[model samples]
Target: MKAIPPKIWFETQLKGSGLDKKFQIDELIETQSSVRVFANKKYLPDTETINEALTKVTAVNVSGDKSGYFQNGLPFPNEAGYFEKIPVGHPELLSPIERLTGSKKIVSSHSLVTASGGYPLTNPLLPYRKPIRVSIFSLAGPSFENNYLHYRLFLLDSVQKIIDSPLFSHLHDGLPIQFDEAKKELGEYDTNKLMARIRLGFPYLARFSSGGFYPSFSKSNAIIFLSEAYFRYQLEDVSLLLASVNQTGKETGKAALLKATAVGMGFFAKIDCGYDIQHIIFPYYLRAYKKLLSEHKFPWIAKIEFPIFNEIQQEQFDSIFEDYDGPTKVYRSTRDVLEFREEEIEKYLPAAINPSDAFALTGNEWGYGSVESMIGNNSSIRFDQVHHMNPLILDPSHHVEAQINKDHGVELTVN
Candidate 1:
């Protein structure tokens, strides 16, 4: 992994990337939020179904199978030149694919759990005619507060009304107190609480990058590619990461911290790395993470931290964060930032272990086999799909094309 210090990288690599003028770089990177639709498990292709369909065809296209393609929803234009606002019942705003993929094969995962922990069934609102997964990540307003308000007013409030209706009583089997308590909680708009509740309703998994970053020291550990922000960033990069997550992988660091405990409102940045396949019957966390890196298609480990958004950016960001304490500041070394932010970052470490470099942090008792555990293959999609075979890429440039089911952007020899 080519590990470059942030300061050196910033000076050498990003100096002319047009960010030096003191405007919020976040705006430039934060594009219009888009959604990916996954076909229902029953409707999804399996080996038998694929073979059955293929045998009926006398000629196979030399190019590839186009039926597997699904439209990646167009990004809504960002109003106010920053985040895009989600209109009421925004799901209707999405283009329909029900004619191509039956409504029954579509799926939506939405649920409501009261503040008192009374869980309820997911109300099936076919906003898209077909069921589709929608996440908060798909919504972005002029600011964090505004975007969150959109979610509350559009999503949670609608669900709340559905649960409180008299007809809802017959559809639901839960207690009256459950509805009342949930209603009370819904009215109380705590950003942190609301975000957590929404996550419970619509959960998406991520496969975090590692490599050059400390506290995340492992050859196999993946790394988020921030240095190449100026490169031709594509949907495939996002999809590959999401599809590569391991089911056996346990949550750690910030994810574990937020997931296990409650906290006030805070805007922690994360890149949505495409379609989550952690729940796929076949998991291949290690294999996917290490696959291209070992072949030098990507670096072994590369991480980046940027300067905290300036006051103007902060104003536009509003106050999702309570204090905004810890590692927002950009430092010379990525390791320095980790050491400085160790109070919260070190939760993954065992007791009495002092915050240190990745080598030191992971070498001692604090390691807990996090990286080592990545080596095991709990499963692979080919095994579950049966008829599917891993595609062979004769050209290294065709790596991303193979993973993401897109028309080969570049000519490639594949089988």
Candidate 2:
């Protein structure tokens, strides 16, 4: 008969999905509602750490339950078996993934290649021994009330723990054979038992540690952990909440549910005032961006400078931006394309695509020259809209950084 408050609705949904217990959601709700929490300087990372982490971060690492976090007993029929299929009898889990266009493609490594010959082409369909072009990008999602950098730090910290721990020292002592043998039975998909396998296909875990299997981290692990643990699992849990709530009469569809979930979870970038530019760039952590600017002279963005594919990627960036300067602008364009596909890329896909509204700056930059060049562009991009005092200053008080703090303990919040 009456409308429930948004916060109350979210809390109820969390309870319905049994996620409130897994995470102290009530604590987060209270903490976030308090103006003091976000304003507290302790929650934010120091400038030095931010600079180093964002600039040098080549890869991210993650840890789940010791049993199946890195290894699982699922039947992976392919060569390098790190990418597991959604286990049989669980078709409902894939509903959200299938609903979005190009989502599965973006998350996974599936591709189509032109048939070619190693020596020569025989038939019109060819021998198919050579390689063709493919697009591959790895993106991670942020958590509620945490700085993206903080979440990343937690991930790295967890990886370090696994590397230092002595528990996995005996991983290579006939464990590979045990898991390989167990794979013959479909019912051997137990978590503890799955730990016997050695994953050598993809270069994730170290082959030997203290004369045993070493569980190391890799760049690819970041993709798997974030995609499987954070994105997919959270989506499914929220979907369950939506369905449970639906039975009680509050009506919502998949798209509406996704948008609402993003809003509540602080998934998208909250722009302060950069809509005028025909091709504007917006960062997800607006407050964090301003803080960095106020403290450190340049806008600190998290980007990996090296070219992923070199040619294919540049073409994508060029198509996204109209002028499209060069490498300085590549990361900006990339931030847009990746974010749009993830949450709300449809709004600016074909026609109005240049402006990026969800950019998250984590101190990842190319060089000082590149940063200055982008800053010059920033000054002119929003000329007519506002007074030209500070080019990219957004009031930190009005916006959120959109991630969790490592001090609160990452595993406690995320795991």
Computed on alpha carbons, the lDDT of every model, listed in order, comes to 0.19, 0.21
Candidate 2 lDDT over residue span 244-317, tens digit each: 22221121121211111111111212111111110111111222222222332111111212212234335433
Kindly give the stretch of ten consecutive residues in candidate 1 with the minimal lDDT sum: 134-143
The number of the candidate with the highest TM-score is 2
Q: Please list the residue runs of candidate 1 whose C-alpha ends up more than 4 Å from where it truly belongs after superposition.
A: 1-154, 158-181, 186-299, 305-415
Assess the local accuracy of residue 265 in candidate 2 as a C-alpha lDDT between 0 and 100: 17
Q: After best superposition, candidate 1 residue 18: deviation in angstroms?
A: 23
Model 2 earns a TM-score of 0.21
What overall lDDT, based on C-alpha atoms, would model 2 receive against the true structure? 0.21
What tens digits encode model 1's per-residue C-alpha lDDT throughout 282-384? 1111122123223222111122121122343233223323333323221212111112123433432110101111111011111112111110011111111
Residue 79, model 1: Cα distance from true site in angstroms:
21
Give the Å error, residue 98, model 2.
35
